[PDB]
Design a protein around this ligand. Sequence first.
Ligand SMILES: CC(=O)c1c(C)[nH]c(-c2nc3cc(N4CCN(C)CC4)ccc3[nH]2)c1C
Length: 125
Amino acid sequence: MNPPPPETSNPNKPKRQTNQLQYLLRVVLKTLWKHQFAWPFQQPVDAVKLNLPDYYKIIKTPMDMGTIKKRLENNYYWNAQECIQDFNTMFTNCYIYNKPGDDIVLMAEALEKLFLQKINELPTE
Ligand SMILES: CC(=O)c1c(C)[nH]c(-c2nc3cc(N4CCN(C)CC4)ccc3[nH]2)c1C
C-alpha cells in the first residue's frame, strides 16, 4: 500500500534559485532522465502497481527523479547540496531495498556514476 508521495511544494520552506540549481535541472536531471535506465526512477515507487507491498515497510525516506524534477521546477530547494542529497537518497534507497547484482541495482549504479560525472563540476556564482 502507498503512502503519500514526497512533497513538491511547501509554503513554509523558503525558495531559492541559484546557477547550480538551474544547472541541476537543465543539464543533470534532464540528461539522466533520458538514459536507458532512467525509467524505474522517474516516478515514486507505486507499491500497489508493482506488487511490492513491503517497499514502504523498508524505505522510510522515499525519493525519485520525478519528485526531484518537480522540486527543481518549483524552486523548492535552498541550494544544490539539498538537491544532490535527494539524488543520493534515491540511489541509496535502491541499494537498501534490493541486493547487489539485481537488475534494478545495476541500473542505479550506472545512473549514479553518470550523476557523479555531471556534478563533479558545477557552475559558479
Ligand atoms: C524497488 C525498486 O528499487 C524499484 C524502483 C526504484 N523503481 C522500480 C520500478 N519503477 C517502475 C516504473 C514502471 N513504469 C512502467 C510504465 N512506464 C510508462 C513508466 C513507469 C514500471 C515498473 C517499475 N519498477 C522498482 C521495482
